[PDB]
Design a protein around this ligand. Structure first.
Ligand SMILES: [Zn+2]
Lengths: 213, 260
């Protein structure tokens, strides 16, 4: 299924947009144009998801101390945060519920600190978004009673705010259309792309390659 | 100094070639952007014309190119000199089909009888060392130079000498001169590289390394010596329409993925 890509040889870059690749023993496999941006975005994303999940699982995830951040919440909203407090700690979001009630956010992870940027209204929405996600069984809690590491086993448990943050970081750092890639740079891209968990889609879910044969 | 060709056959061979030319196919070659080798065995490469990706049989294009160059540059060819000597008598040993010695000597006899013509019209110098009637001591001094920087692979050389006496009919001017140009081009076309199973353990490290070397040499010849020449002087005849296939229309691929 994925082992088909491992049997692909790089030809060269096409229109500074694609990387043309070529495949005896042809059981559903001859020519495929790999989207260079989607290829780099994919490799880059899986590196970012590995970095985040290895950090979170080993308790090495950075949680920068936030000062004077109190957010007004509903009685049920306050109860929803009192419930999943332990869950938000796993992501570096350390807060205390006051008592109408108020959410006293003590700490935040370095990426969320950056994206929030003093917008209490944005931050409230993002935590509520995950609290509701957990509550309505849309997202599972992070089980850390497992004591190598496979980031994709825990990928589904990453809050949407982080997911969004990692997708944009991947896309931004990635190679763009109209960029010059040497045959060697392409060999390397496709070499790493074939070592991905999901090499057939990009960070934003779009297909990373279209066979032409 | 360029030599005058007052031969009726050469002017008739040029008219046939000029009429065969297809403008739409030649417009694809004139503006080609060579991507790379797709199949070393079937002799397939990929080029990009405008926003379209094409699949080219380079063996066919090379056949027609080296046939065209020969017709244009008739009796105005260079010379390729050969410590390591190659004998025509020992070159034909590859064929076990010609079990008889007098049958093997019959081929050499047709070439030496035409040695003066071959060196003056096609720059194929053939010099004997022994007796005037002796056929065992007959070598090949020089081969014509069609493209500067391109040295033809001598793997197909025993077939070239075999087919020059056997296939080429020396009993008609136009058919004989056409036959020799068709034989030189076959020798001049880059060799096929048959596929070998790299993942199979039953093959030695040398077999696997040499196959890679053959693959890398073919791509170098195509990118640096062969395809620039094709983009420059190649005139595509109508029968090559079958050997130039569209595989992708690139604006149809921009639709699948837009700027993130
Ligand atoms: Zn994307």
């Amino acid at each position: 299924s994925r082992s088909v890509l491992a049997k692909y040889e790089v030809i060269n870059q096409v229109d500074k947009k694609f990387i043309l690749i070529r495949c005896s023993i042809h059981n559903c496999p001859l020519l495929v144009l790999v989207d260079q941006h989607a290829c780099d975005e994919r490799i880059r994303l899986e590196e970012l998801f590995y970095s985040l999940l290895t950090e979170v699982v080993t308790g090495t995830f950075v949680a920068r101390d936030l000062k004077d951040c109190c957010i007004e919440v509903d009685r049920t909203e306050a109860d929803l945060f009192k419930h999943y407090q332990s869950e938000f700690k796993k992501w570096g979001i350390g807060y205390e519920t006051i008592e109408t009630s108020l959410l006293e956010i003590k700490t935040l992870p370095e990426m969320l600190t950056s994206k929030y940027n003093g917008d209490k209204d944005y931050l409230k929405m993002v935590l509520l978004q995950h609290a509701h996600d957990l509550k309505d069984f849309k997202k599972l809690p992070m089980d850390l009673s497992h004591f190598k590491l496979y980031w994709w086993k825990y990928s589904s448990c990453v809050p949407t705010v982080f997911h969004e943050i990692l997708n944009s970081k991947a896309c931004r750092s990635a190679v763009m259309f109209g960029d010059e890639l040497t045959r060697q740079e392409c060999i390397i891209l496709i070499s790493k792309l074939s070592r991905c968990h999901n090499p057939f889609e990009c960070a934003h879910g779009r297909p990373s390659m279209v066979p032409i044969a | 100094e360029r030599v005058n060709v007052n031969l009726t056959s050469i002017k008739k061979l040029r008219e046939k070639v000029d009429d065969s030319i297809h403008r739409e196919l030649t417009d694809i070659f004139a503006n080609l952007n060579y991507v790379g080798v797709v199949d070393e065995e079937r002799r397939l490469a990929a080029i990009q014309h405008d926003l379209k990706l094409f699949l080219i049989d380079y063996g066919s294009v090379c056949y027609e190119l080296f046939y065209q160059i020969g017709l244009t540059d008739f009796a105005n060819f260079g010379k390729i000199n050969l410590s390591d000597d190659i004998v025509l008598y020992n070159l034909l040993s590859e064929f076990d089909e010609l079990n008889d010695d007098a049958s093997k000597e019959k081929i050499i006899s047709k070439i030496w009888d035409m040695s003066s013509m071959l060196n003056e019209y096609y720059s194929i110098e053939l010099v004997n060392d022994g007796l005037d009637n002796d056929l065992k001591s007959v070598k090949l001094k020089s081969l014509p130079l069609l493209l500067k920087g391109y040295i033809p692979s001598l793997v197909k050389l025993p077939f070239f000498i075999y087919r020059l006496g056997k296939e080429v009919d020396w009993e008609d001017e136009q058919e004989c001169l056409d036959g020799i140009l068709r034989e030189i081009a076959l020798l001049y076309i880059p060799d096929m590289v048959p596929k070998v199973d790299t993942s199979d353990a039953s093959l030695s490290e040398d077999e696997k390394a040499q196959f890679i070397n053959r693959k890398e040499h073919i791509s170098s010849l195509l990118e640096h010596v062969l395809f620039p020449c094709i983009k420059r002087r190649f005139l595509a005849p109508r029968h090559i329409l079958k050997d130039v296939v569209e595989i992708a229309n690139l604006p149809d691929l921009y639709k699948v993925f837009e700027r993130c």
